[PDB]
Write a protein that binds this ligand. Structure first.
Ligand code: DGD
Ligand code: CLA
Ligand code: CLA
Ligand code: CLA
Ligand code: CLA
Ligand code: LMG
Ligand code: LMG
Ligand code: SQD
Ligand code: LHG
Ligand code: BCR
Ligand code: BCR
Ligand code: OEY
Ligand code: CL
Ligand code: CL
Ligand code: FE2
Lengths: 34, 505, 37, 81, 341, 36, 33, 34, 38, 55, 30, 56, 65, 32, 30
């Protein structure tokens, strides 16, 4: 139902916000792996 | 010197004296089985398999002999109760003498292998060092095991060339030894189908022959010989122990829950048959059927065989015993002599009342009578001053139907209560308490003792598995870690891979 | 035929004697009530 | 000494607290809502304060069958509707 | 250089948490046994199995919260999610006590994983595997109390429920029904646990008060070096001290530390055996000689007879509520009670 | 990088703890679980 | 007290048999030295 | 030059993420009234 | 014939198998990208 | 043991959980208490003449 | 006979104590 | 008598639900745990000074 | 070491101590039998336990009559 | 048969005790 | 228990016979 979207919506901004703050420095680590 | 806990390690690289130790062990086990049956025969009373079956007299190997078809004695009696027989040589007495003669011949062979320990067979013909080819040995033995397991099920159990095995109806009333035909269908994996036990040994017998055959011809792989230290006889003891405790857990469980190989006329009934009122359901089905067919109450309960009513009594529940209440069940409630009859309780209004039976958990239990709807209508009160349900207030009476007391009503409140005190145990029997000076306290059955002992051993052997297994994989440090281990091997970040020195950064 | 080269001697020292005896005597003291029952 | 980045350095860093000053209240709020919305009651089957008993009932709705067990509790629930 | 060794390689790399081949069993199962206990204590009831509230969501606190055992009706059912009891429904599964078997089985397998981990790390580092052997003592306790004991009984219902007060109820159950304190296999457990705790305190305090002076300052900790070959306390002054205070003392550091392994490990093993007996109601409940005399001699009273009165009190007072499926109805007049109380 | 002094992180976080725990202790007297 | 009679032989053997084993091994240890 | 995403990272967030969430739910619970 | 508990059985059997293969698929992959030098 | 000598006893959550109507909803604490009750009413069975065992 | 047994075992323990202390193997340095 | 004392104690004081008895259990379980740990860790790392046929 | 008539007959059965199939040999096939055996034991277990219910398999004493 | 039940313990120690003495003396002889 | 005791003691004697003959101190000639 809809309480699920309610509950899940903070965790997307939580993950979205981390993914954009951390993107450029994660791109480095994967390159290094050959 | 060796420490006491290590004396038997002198056998590790000595195949003949290992064989001599193993023969002596085998001698003592067969000797024990011989001795134990002799003591059982000297104390077994076979005059009443109805109320004094073997399982009430604390018989332990008797039922295992009967399970595979030894049923009678040179004295002329059989456990099924028929007289006049001649079992031939393979009587209880004859089985016991076999195991004793066997034990004696094993003793001698052991002396021989101990003195002549230095056989060339045991020497590796390349190096002249003692050595055993364990992989090929497993193949040979696994093949022997498959032949015997095939032949056991193909011939003994079928009755093709043997007696078969103990089988009974579902209420343990008509047991006997009988040939069994294999059940190849999926119901043969049902533990309560005896045909499955036949299928199992035939089928698994051939799998053993084929695997034994594989294991003789095909060498273990290099990866696996190294992983499991297959040059080390102690890896076999490690895995061997693990298999044995696997098997010991299994036989404990089927004994406790019941299977086709643990029948209730040999081992007693289970605690579950009391939990579910198994025999009471059937007993009552029969009386209702006598009664719709129009027999009087006296007639309907007189029709119930005593063997069935004896099953419906908590003194034969294996879960009512105690760890230091020793001996046979008969030492506790006495020797069952006679079913007294089925007790019916009526209040003064002539409602039928029902004694709440005691659960297996409870050493003591109160006396509460109820109606068909579950409503408490009488009890034996503890505090008397404010009691409303007392037998005296409610005018409870007891009438007996069937048995030794059939057709008799008691009204005087102290007699009535006294049978109320027995009804909580189920059906009501007369016992002989003087003959063994019975103390009146429930003991457990051979089902109880066998389960307990095998569960306890199984757990203990798990530690043996662990111990000897550890000692196989770590034999190189048994005596202590290397004194020139450098703190670089052991400190962090030194080696990309832990303990592998080839990965230094 | 040679003597078995695998034979070895057993040792029990005095502390092990003392430890072992205490174990048995104390075990006896604990189980004894249960044996008499 | 194993090559990962040390903890004492991650949680004094601006970047770390810039992500986690978002991710930590989001989780606290997320779980709050899981309760405040009632979804936790439903996901798990847990009775609400008004639905342990039927109004004039004082009987536990105790499961008494193995293979009819599912349908048993369902019948108790409709006894509250 | 096959794939199997490539994976061996990666599993056994030196990292902040070592993984290993045992990690594969250990980690999923340990995380799940724990995820389920926290899941269930925070959110899930015992209303339908026990008639109890049992989660924070219901109003319980950390002492009274538990993941409770399934209903007696379930028998020894494995109670798999996809099984004939829960029929795939997550919600019903939880309400039937499904999480109890979940925790208990992933628990069992996780303990295996852990012990295999102790085997795995010890082989790589080149030490003897005695920490793994000691860990058999916990394993035996766990399997005997949580698996073997109810498997002997009517059902899982009578195993321990996972929770603080629920476990407290289990301790009292065994007193009233099994008279477990009277069992010599428990008494050997007590002497091993308390003996261990004794040994633990006394060996820590001896070392701390037989230290050599290897630094100048008043904090004696600074003055150890992990790599020094020299011992850091005096076994000679420890031995003389205890010989003269207590009469005997250790003289052999290897025997001492092996004895610290032996004492608590063995006591747990002995209690495991006892509980195995109790699976079957094979209790050391009574002393027959005592009962015969007291039956015949009403002036004969001991602490043995007094304790059974208490056991009798516990059974009749807790049973109806504690075993709801038995519909025990004990009208007041039948309850055992002393005067006035 | 090493900016936020560690003592600050420890004081604040610690206060975070006391906060929530006192919420759970307050709840033992209010609402569900209180006997009222 | 009406007590199990085999209790006595059980307790007496339970002590004597293991105790004697230990003594045998101690004494043949001293004689080596 | 460290990595951001390690085994250690996963282990940490495997526990932590649902801790905070669970603390959220239990916080809300103190305000439930019968 | 093919009863619900047997359908469930296979359900559990396929489920279990997916989890180990997915897990072992993941683990083989990482082990090849991220190797030890030697 | 020394402070319970002055009868500062363990936590008491008997009936701490009730429903919207005010039914008691039992926890494990309440089961514990049923067993504590059976200990209470039986100990020193002849020694009490009055309804509370205040010492 | 129970009493005699209980007290004989107890008394053996006290004697073991005596020999364990005064007739111990005496610890010898290095 | 010891058990009698600890049964009556629980009826009169609910000692299992007392946090100081819970710290005693933690002290006592903890002590057995650490005893076995320390004993097994030292035993695990004895330096080789002996043969297989003699006590470590 | 003693030669005996019987020793000589059994000799080649203890002749190959240490001989190995190279590498992994039959391990992948053993693996197959192991997983098959596990699944078979599961079935056997879930039948006894009554989480696997099958047609005409009545797991009771009443499958004796 | 109604026999003396202290006869078993008497026979038992009659055998064991002097028997034990001799084994002890023989073994510590063999080991010197 | 009396029958057992008699047969046990007789059995130990026969076992003694066997070691007395076959496991004697062998005589030797100096
Ligand atoms: C050591 C290292 C540890 C490593 C272990 C790692 C974790 C592994 C986890 C193992 C899972 C095992 C669960 C077994 C479930 C069980 O038993 O389930 C129970 C079922 C039997 O079912 C039970 O059967 C009982 C008897 O019923 C019978 O009786 C009734 C009335 O008489 C009716 O006739 C009924 O139809 C008939 O079936 C009751 O009905 C129970 O309620 C019902 O559950 O067995 C079956 O699953 C199979 C039973 C035989 C298998 C043997 C199992 C051995 C384990 C027990 C060993 C200890 C023995 C305990 C005794 C001491
Ligand atoms: C698995 C083995 C096994 C099993 C299950 C049984 C079962 C049975 N036997 Mg048989 N018996 C066996 C082996 C077995 N026996 C053996 C090997 C012998 C020869 C010694 C006998 C000799 C024998 C006789 C002579 C008689 C029986 C009888 C019986 C019955 C009653 C037994 C009883 O009272 O238990 C009592 C059990 C106990 C009191 C438990 C003993 C366990 C002790 C207490 C544990 C020791 C603990 C240890 C010291 C702890 C320290 C460890 C730590 C320091 C590390 C029962 C059917 C009796 C019967 O009724 O037959 C007609 C009977 O008279 N048996
Ligand atoms: C087939 C089973 C089996 C076999 C063949 C062995 C064989 C061995 N074990 Mg293992 N072991 C086993 C089971 C087995 N074990 C189990 C089940 C356990 C767990 C209890 C262990 C635990 C264990 C430990 C902890 C150690 C061994 C050691 C040894 C070695 C020396 C033993 C010795 O000299 O004893 C000497 C024993 C005595 C002098 C007297 C023992 C008296 C006991 C306590 C009671 C006797 C009861 C009575 C005789 C009836 C038998 C019991 C019944 C089950 C049949 C030897 C290779 C030792 C080793 O590794 O050496 C390197 C060692 O330290 N074993
Ligand atoms: C990896 C370790 C691990 C282990 C050992 C277990 C073990 C267990 N879990 Mg857990 N579980 C795990 C991981 C694990 N789980 C993970 C990662 C999750 C989250 C996804 C779960 C989620 C979970 C739930 C939700 C439940 C369990 C349950 C169980 C139990 C039943 C297992 C069963 O019946 O499997 C049976 C199946 C197998 C053992 C699979 C065998 C694989 C075969 C050999 C391969 C077959 C291949 C195929 C046929 C060939 C190709 C076919 C073609 C179509 C392609 C058992 C104790 C149940 C439980 O606890 O009930 C009380 C339960 O309800 N588990
Ligand atoms: C002086 C008082 C005293 C003492 C010292 C003991 C001591 C003992 N008792 Mg007894 N007890 C007593 C009084 C006492 N008792 C009384 C008065 C009663 C009333 C009858 C009882 C009733 C009683 C019962 C009913 C039982 C015991 C048991 C035990 C043993 C507990 C073993 C253990 O470590 O469990 C701890 C548990 C384990 C080691 C199992 C596995 C532990 C795993 C490894 C935990 C892993 C945790 C995981 C990593 C996550 C943790 C985080 C999580 C918390 C969030 C021990 C021998 C038990 C027993 O005998 O066991 C067989 C048992 O069931 N006792
Ligand atoms: C070596 C030689 C010395 C060995 C003997 C050492 C003494 C050990 C004593 C232990 C036995 C104690 C029994 C006392 C009771 C007794 O005397 O009554 C004697 C009882 C017999 O019971 C008697 O029977 C009589 C009619 O037959 C009457 O009923 C008598 O009244 C009744 O007492 O003895 C037993 O039945 C003996 C067999 C017990 C063996 C099976 C139990 C297996 C349980 C598993 C144990 C494994 C646990 C492992 C844990 C580690
Ligand atoms: C690296 C990252 C680190 C990862 C984090 C790993 C976390 C795993 C550890 C989980 C800890 C389990 C404690 C849960 C307690 C809880 O939430 O209480 C939550 C409960 C909620 O409080 C209850 O709320 C109810 C809601 O209706 C009612 O209001 C009740 O009255 C109220 O009590 O709090 C308490 O009971 C009160 C505070 C006391 C908390 C318990 C003290 C801690 C217990 C000791 C710690 C356990 C360790 C044992 C060690 C052996
Ligand atoms: C329904 C099924 C559900 C269950 C399925 C779950 C599957 C389980 C798979 C679990 C594996 C997760 C661990 C790897 C995660 C990852 O990011 O690290 C792999 C690598 C990380 O980066 C690297 O990290 C490395 C260090 S380490 O290996 O992470 O320690 C380092 O060597 C390297 O330089 C760096 O770039
Ligand atoms: C209670 C007993 C502990 C006594 C305290 C001291 C211990 C002795 C210390 C050794 C010498 C000094 C080093 C002190 C240093 C010290 O003790 O702590 C400091 C250390 C953090 O150190 P950093 O790497 O930040 O810096 C190095 C420091 O030593 C600073 O000098 O803390 C941690 O390791 C945090 C990890 C917990 C969070 C990890 C969560 C993920 C784990 C998941 C795995 C689950 C468990 C495994 C499964 C089985
Ligand atoms: C020489 C010879 C002979 C003879 C034979 C004989 C005579 C035999 C013997 C044998 C036998 C006769 C044996 C027996 C055995 C026994 C045993 C081996 C036992 C065991 C026991 C035990 C081990 C136990 C234990 C215990 C106890 C004691 C207590 C309780 C617990 C238990 C159970 C654990 C002949 C003629 C044939 C031929 C020629 C030669
Ligand atoms: C079951 C299940 C599952 C899983 C799940 C999981 C895995 C979970 C997780 C979960 C978790 C993982 C959670 C956690 C949480 C926790 C919490 C709840 C915490 C709390 C704590 C606290 C509160 C603390 C505090 C404190 C104190 C009290 C004192 C001291 C200090 C401190 C601060 C620590 C699945 C999906 C498979 C499905 C099936 C079922
Ligand atoms: O606990 Mn109950 O309380 Ca302290 O006293 Mn009143 O009874 Mn009696 O003497 Mn001993 O026992
Ligand atoms: Cl009292
Ligand atoms: Cl008073
Ligand atoms: Fe130390």
């Amino acid at each position: 139902d809809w309480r699920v979207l309610v509950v899940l919506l903070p965790v997307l901004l939580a993950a979205g916000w981390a993914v954009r703050n951390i993107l450029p420095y994660a791109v480095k680590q994967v390159q290094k792996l050959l | 010197g060796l420490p006491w806990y290590r004396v038997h390690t002198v056998l590790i690289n000595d195949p003949g004296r290992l064989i001599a130790a193993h023969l002596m062990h085998t001698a003592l086990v067969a000797g024990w089985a011989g001795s134990m049956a002799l003591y059982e025969l000297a104390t077994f009373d076979p005059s009443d398999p109805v109320l004094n079956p073997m399982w009430r007299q604390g018989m332990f190997v008797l039922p295992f002999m009967a399970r595979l078809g030894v049923t009678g004695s040179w004295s002329g009696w059989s456990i099924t109760g028929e007289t006049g027989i001649d079992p031939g040589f393979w009587s209880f007495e004859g089985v016991a003498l076999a195991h004793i003669v066997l034990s004696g011949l094993l003793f001698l062979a052991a002396c021989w292998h101990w003195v002549y320990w230095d056989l060339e067979l045991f020497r590796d013909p390349r190096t002249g060092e003692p050595a055993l080819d364990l992989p090929k040995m497993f193949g040979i033995h696994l093949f022997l095991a498959g032949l015997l397991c095939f032949g056991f099920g193909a011939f003994h159990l079928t009755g093709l060339f043997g007696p078969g095995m103990w089988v009974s109806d579902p209420y343990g009333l008509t047991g006997s030894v009988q040939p069994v035909a294999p059940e190849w269908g999926p119901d043969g994996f049902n533990p309560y189908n005896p045909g499955g036990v036949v299928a199992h040994h035939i089928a698994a017998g051939i799998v053993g022959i084929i695997a034994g055959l594989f294991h003789i011809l095909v060498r273990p792989p290099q990866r696996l010989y190294k992983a499991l230290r297959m040059g080390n006889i102690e890896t076999v003891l490690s895995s061997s122990i693990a298999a044995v405790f696997f098997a010991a857990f299994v036989v404990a469980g089927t004994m406790w829950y019941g299977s086709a190989t643990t029948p209730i006329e040999l081992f007693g009934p289970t605690r579950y048959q009391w939990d579910s009122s198994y025999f009471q359901q059937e007993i009552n089905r029969r009386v209702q059927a006598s009664l719709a067919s129009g027999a009087t109450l006296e007639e309907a309960w007189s029709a119930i065989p005593e063997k069935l009513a004896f099953y419906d009594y908590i003194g034969n529940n294996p879960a009512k015993g105690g760890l230091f209440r020793t001996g046979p069940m008969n030492k506790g409630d006495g020797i069952a002599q006679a079913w007294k009859g089925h007790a019916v309780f009526r209040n003064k209004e002539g409602e039928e009342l029902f004694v709440r039976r005691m659960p297996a958990f409870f050493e003591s239990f109160p006396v509460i009578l109820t109606d068909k709807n579950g409503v408490v209508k009488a009890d034996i009160p503890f505090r008397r001053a404010e009691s409303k349900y007392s037998f005296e207030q409610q005018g409870v009476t007891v009438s007996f139907y069937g048995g030794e007391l059939n057709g008799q009503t008691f009204t005087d409140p102290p007699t009535v209560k006294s049978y109320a005190r027995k009804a909580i145990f189920g059906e009501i029997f007369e016992f002989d308490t003087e003959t063994l000076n019975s103390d009146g306290i429930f003991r457990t059955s051979p089902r109880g003792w066998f389960t307990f002992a095998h569960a306890v051993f199984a757990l203990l052997f798990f530690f043996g598995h662990i111990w000897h297994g550890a000692r196989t994989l770590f034999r190189d440090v048994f005596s202590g870690i290397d004194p020139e281990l450098s703190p670089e091997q052991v400190e962090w970040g030194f080696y990309q891979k832990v303990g592998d020195v080839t990965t230094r950064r | 035929m040679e003597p078995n080269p695998n034979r070895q001697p057993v040792e029990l020292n005095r502390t092990s004697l003392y430890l072992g005896l205490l174990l048995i005597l104390v075990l006896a003291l604990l189980f004894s009530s249960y044996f008499f029952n | 000494t194993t090559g990962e980045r040390p903890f004492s350095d991650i949680i004094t860093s601006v970047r770390y607290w810039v992500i986690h000053s978002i991710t930590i209240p989001a989780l606290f709020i997320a779980g709050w809502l899981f309760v405040s919305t009632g979804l936790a009651y439903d996901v798990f089957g847990t009775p609400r304060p008004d639905s342990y008993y039927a109004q004039e009932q004082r009987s536990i709705p105790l499961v008494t069958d193995r293979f009819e067990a599912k349908q048993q509790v369902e019948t108790f629930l409709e006894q509250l509707k | 250089r096959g794939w199997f060794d490539i994976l061996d390689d990666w599993l056994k790399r030196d990292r902040f948490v070592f993984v290993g081949w045992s990690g594969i069993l250990l980690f999923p199962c340990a995380y799940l046994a724990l995820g389920g206990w926290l899941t269930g204590t925070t959110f899930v009831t015992s209303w339908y199995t026990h008639g109890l509230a049992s989660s924070y969501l219901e109003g319980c606190n950390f002492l009274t919260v538990a993941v409770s055992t399934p209903a007696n009706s379930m028998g020894h059912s494995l109670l798999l999610l996809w099984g004939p009891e829960a029929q795939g429904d997550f919600t019903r599964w939880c309400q039937l006590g499904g999480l109890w078997t979940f925790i208990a089985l992933h628990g069992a397998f996780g303990l295996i994983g852990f012990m295999l981990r102790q085997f795995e790390i010890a082989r790589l580092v080149g030490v003897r595997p005695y920490n793994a052997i000691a860990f058999s003592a916990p394993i035996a306790v766990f399997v005997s109390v949580f698996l073997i004991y109810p498997l002997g009984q009517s059902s899982w219902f009578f195993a321990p429920s996972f929770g603080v007060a629920a476990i407290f109820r289990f301790l009292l159950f065994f007193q009233g029904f099994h008279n477990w304190t009277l069992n010599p296999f428990h008494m050997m457990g007590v002497a091993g646990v308390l003996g261990g705790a004794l040994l633990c305190a006394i060996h820590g305090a001896t070392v701390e008060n037989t230290l050599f002076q290897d630094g100048e300052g008043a904090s004696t900790f600074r003055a150890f070096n992990p790599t020094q070959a020299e011992e850091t306390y005096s076994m000679v002054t420890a031995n003389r001290f205890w010989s003269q205070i207590f009469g005997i003392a250790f003289s052999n550091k290897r025997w001492l530390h092996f004895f610290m392994l032996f004492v608590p490990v063995t006591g747990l093993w002995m209690s495991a055996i006892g509980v195995v007996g109790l699976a079957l109601n094979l209790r050391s409940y009574d002393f027959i000689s005592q009962e015969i005399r007291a039956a015949e001699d009403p002036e004969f009273e001991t602490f043995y007879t007094k304790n059974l009165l208490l056991n009798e009190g516990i059974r009749a007072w807790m049973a109806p509520q504690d075993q709801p499926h038995e519909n025990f109805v004990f009208p007041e007049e039948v309850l055992p009670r002393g005067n006035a109380l | 990088g090493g900016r936020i002094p560690l003592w600050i992180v420890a004081t604040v976080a610690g206060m975070g703890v006391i906060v929530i725990v006192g919420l759970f202790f307050y709840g033992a007297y209010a609402g569900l679980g209180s006997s009222l | 007290m009406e007590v199990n009679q085999l209790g006595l032989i059980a307790t007496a053997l339970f002590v004597l048999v293991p105790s004697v084993f230990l003594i045998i091994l101690y004494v043949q240890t001293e004689s080596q030295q | 030059s460290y990595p951001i995403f390690t085994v250690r990272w996963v282990a940490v967030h495997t526990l932590a993420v649902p801790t905070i969430f669970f603390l959220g739910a239990i916080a809300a619970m103190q305000f439930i009234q019968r | 014939t093919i009863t619900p508990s047997l359908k469930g059985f296979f359900i559990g059997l396929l489920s279990g198998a997916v989890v180990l293969g997915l897990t072992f698929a993941v683990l083989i992959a990482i082990s090849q990208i991220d190797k030890v030098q030697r | 043991i020394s402070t319970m000598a002055f009868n500062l006893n363990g936590f008491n959550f008997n009936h701490s959980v009730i429903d919207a109507k005010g039914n008691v909803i039992n926890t494990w604490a309440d089961i514990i208490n049923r067993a504590n009750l059976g200990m209470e009413v039986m100990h020193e069975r002849n020694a009490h003449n009055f309804p509370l065992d205040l010492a | 006979m129970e009493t005699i047994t209980y007290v004989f075992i107890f008394a053996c323990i006290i004697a073991l104590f005596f020999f364990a202390i005064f007739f111990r193997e005496p610890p010898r340095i290095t | 008598g010891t058990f009698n004392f600890m049964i009556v104690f629980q009826a009169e004081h609910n000692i299992l639900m007392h946090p100081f008895h819970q710290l005693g259990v933690a002290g006592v379980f903890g002590g057995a745990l650490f005893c076995a740990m320390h004993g097994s860790l030292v035993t695990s790392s004895l330096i080789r000074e002996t043969t297989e046929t003699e006590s470590a | 070491a003693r030669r005996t008539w019987l020793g000589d007959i059994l000799r080649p059965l203890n002749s190959e101590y240490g001989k190995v199939a190279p590498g992994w040999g039959t391990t992948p096939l053993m693996a197959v039998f192991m997983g098959l055996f596990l699944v078979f034991l599961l079935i056997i277990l879930e039948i006894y336990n009554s989480t696997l219910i099958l047609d005409g398999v009545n797991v009771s004493w009443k499958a004796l009559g």
